[PDB]
Amino acid sequence: EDIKVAVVGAMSGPVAQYGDQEFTGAEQAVADINAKGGIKGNKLQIAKYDDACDPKQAVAVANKVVNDGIKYVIGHLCSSSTQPASDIYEDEGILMITPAATAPELTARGYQLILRTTGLDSDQGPTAAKYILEKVKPQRIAIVHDKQQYGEGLARAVQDGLKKGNANVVFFDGITAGEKDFSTLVARLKKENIDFVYYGGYHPEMGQILRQARAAGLKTQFMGPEGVANVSLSNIAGESAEGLLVTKPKNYDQVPANKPIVDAIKAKKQDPSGAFVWTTYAALQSLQAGLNQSDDPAEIAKYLKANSVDTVMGPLTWDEKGDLKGFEFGVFDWHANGTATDAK
């Protein structure tokens, strides 16, 4: 024996690009782990499947994983695919570790064999709040959102961490997604003299506000979450987006210590910059730490949920629901050409 791990991806559709990232992270991980001894001499063997990211497909792959005797699943890529197999895997005591599903309900059910190795959108609020608090230290903050869920939930979470922290949140305002005319918002930023704006939404509107806010001679520093970091933003904003602070995953790619992994991924002519390469690799590192402990999926879940795991992504810790604990996104200084740098 050799240990089998089912790595479930989309190596199929338009999403084939995310599936690619995970197979590259998973594959690198297994060669590193078994090159160094495996698990007490027991080598890992990836046994790959295809979801295609169809929730009907997903259950099909989960029925196969089962009837194939696989007990450790790495994945399910998309929230829509995963939820459905989630049930199937709990029903049959199979541990599932996902490196990309961020749907809050995967973890709201009371399942015990689900772990994530990705941060969640929710996670960006506390990131923002902290950064503002400790690094930016603005004087008069306005918080605006699109009254869309994503955006409003993040404006509401930043808003909260802003007052435990005793910040001066001058006003909290809603915007009608699809507005292109923000004259009204910008005259108000002018007047109540805001120096920092946090915008919870998407790039259309962000690119709108920026253009418009600079044209009015407003020097206000803006911050948004990743839903804002799109090529489209810069195709439209240009210059106006220079200096926007953005919340998004850290380039694990780039930490001095992941070097040997980057070096090596790139040797096989594969792309080590994608994000699920790090979340998948880290997912493999956690299952390995657990395996050195016990064979039992319930025993690994337990061991993981109470200890910390040192991964390629940093020391990792889970809550009882299996969500990453004290997880943080990186802050990036965006540029006029669609490029972004690590912020101080």
Q: Are 62 and 85 in contact (CB under 8 A)?
A: yes
Is residue 235 classed as helix, strand or coil in its secondary structure? Answer: helix
Q: State the CB neighbour count (10 A cutoff) for residue 243.
A: 15
Name the burial class of residue 67, with classes exposed (0-12), middle (13-18) and buried (19+) by CB atoms within 10 angstroms of its CB: exposed
Q: State the CB neighbour count (10 A cutoff) for residue 141.
A: 23
Q: What's the resolution in A?
A: 2.4
Dist. CA 94–CA 115, nearest whole Å: 12
Which residues have C-beta within 8 Å of that of residue 259, sequence separation ≥ 6?
Answer: none
Dist. CA 88–CA 60, nearest whole Å: 10
Q: Are 16 and 24 in contact (CB under 8 A)?
A: no
Q: Burial code of 286-317, b = ≥16 C-beta within 10 A, e = fewer?
A: bbbbbbeeeeebeebbebbbeeebebbbbebe
Instruction: Read off the tokens for 145.
Output: 């959102």
Closest CA to 281 of 7, 37, 48: 7
Q: Are 125 and 158 in contact (CB under 8 A)?
A: yes
Domains of the chain, each with CATH number or no CATH: 1-120+250-328 (3.40.50.2300), 121-249+329-344 (3.40.50.2300)
The length of the chain in residues reads: 344
Half-sphere exposure of 208 (CA within 13 A, CB side): 19
Structure obtained using = X-ray
Instruction: Read off the tokens for 234.
Output: 């810069």
